[PDB]
Amino acid sequence: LVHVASVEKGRSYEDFQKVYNAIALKLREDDEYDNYIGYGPVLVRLAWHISGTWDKHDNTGGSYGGTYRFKKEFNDPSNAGLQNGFKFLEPIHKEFPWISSGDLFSLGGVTAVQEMQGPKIPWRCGRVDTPEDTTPDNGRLPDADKDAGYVRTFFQRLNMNDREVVALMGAHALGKTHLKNSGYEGPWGAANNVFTNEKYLNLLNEDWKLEKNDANNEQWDSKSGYMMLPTDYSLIQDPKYLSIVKEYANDQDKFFKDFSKAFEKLLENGITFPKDAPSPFIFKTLEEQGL
Numbered sequence: 001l002v003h004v005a006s007v008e009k010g011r012s013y014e015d016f017q018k019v020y021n022a023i024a025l026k027l028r029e030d031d032e033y034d035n036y037i038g039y040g041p042v043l044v045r046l047a048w049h050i051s052g053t054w055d056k057h058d059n060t061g062g063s064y065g066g067t068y069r070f071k072k073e074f075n076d077p078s079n080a081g082l083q084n085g086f087k088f089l090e091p092i093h094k095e096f097p098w099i100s101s102g103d104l105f106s107l108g109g110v111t112a113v114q115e116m117q118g119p120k121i122p123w124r125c126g127r128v129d130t131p132e133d134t135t136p137d138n139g140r141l142p143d144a145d146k147d148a149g150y151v152r153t154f155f156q157r158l159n160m161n162d163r164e165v166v167a168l169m170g171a172h173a174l175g176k177t178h179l180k181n182s183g184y185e186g187p188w189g190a191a192n193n194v195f196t197n198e199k200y201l202n203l204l205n206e207d208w209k210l211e212k213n214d215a216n217n218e219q220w221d222s223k224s225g226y227m228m229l230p231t232d233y234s235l236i237q238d239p240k241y242l243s244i245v246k247e248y249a250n251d252q253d254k255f256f257k258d259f260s261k262a263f264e265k266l267l268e269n270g271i272t273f274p275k276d277a278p279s280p281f282i283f284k285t286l287e288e289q290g291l
């Protein structure tokens with residue numbers, strides 16, 4: 001498969017900045033969701049799950065075709081709870097019907113990170129909606145009950161290396177786990193809707209204990225009332241991942257720079273951009289615009 005990026009006809013930077021603005025204003029307004037965490041966390045989870053289905057071997061899956069809109073992918077067990085992020089974005093798509101699904105789902109992830117005080121993420125437009133038979137089969141997204149070898153191998157299918165994987169996993173300081181969605185329950189840390197290097201500090205400084213939760217799954221719980229997945233615990237069990245964890249724990253700006261590079265790579269996997277294509281856009285925040 002080849003997937004060539006095609007800009008939505010006649011649209012420029014200013015059109016996409018208006019879709020970003022609409023997502024950012026609604027994030028501000030619907031502040032009460034999930035006990036006042038807001039929708040920022042589930043929107044960056046949605047952007048990673050529509051991108052995480054990519055397979056480098058045959059170019060299937062990934063963000064291009066916007067196939068999460070189809071039933072097979074929408075009802076994948078691994079996507080449980082993302083229906084909330086979808087319903088958030090739906091009035092926004094009615095307001096700007098010209099944007100493709102893949103572009104809207106991925107831009108929601110970018111808008112969430114920047115509005116939660118994260119780094120600027122360069123974003124490219126041009127994903128094109130593809131038919132229901134291009135929808136990937138369930139089962140390509142990663143299990144949580146596994147170790148650092150599983151993690152390294154999994155992320156190789158998206159050709160992410162060690163530094164990219166540890167930077168990406170920094171997103172597990174956002175939001176929380178929910179028993180009814182995944183069989184895991186608890187907050188990741190103290191600041192769950194502001195983007196920081198907190199995951200790495202908790203990984204190095206908390207007194208973590210292995211326990212079973214009410215769904216019979218194992219998770220690591222700390223004295224502070226925080227939890228972590230087995231796959232997050234991996235990052236301090238593997239010697240290569242651990243030196244990168246330490247690096248991000250001591251330097252939030254290095255974490256922001258690397259997360260920014262790896263998250264854009266993730267959202268662009270499987271997409272060929274022509275060089276007539278516009279450069280990646282850097283959107284201004286509401287605050288930068290005085291809105």
Ligand code: HEM
Pocket residue numbers: 041042044045048080081142143144145151168169171172174175176177178179181182183184231263
């Ligand atoms: C081995 C990799 C990964 C596994 C196994 C994994 C698994 C999970 C699970 C089980 C949850 C809890 C879902 C729930 O109960 O609602 C979760 C939440 C979340 N994940 Fe991941 N994750 C992985 C990678 C990532 C990456 C790479 C990102 C983003 C760049 C990410 C972002 C998030 C966010 C923001 C949440 C919180 C969502 C919310 O608050 O509703 N995860 N993850």
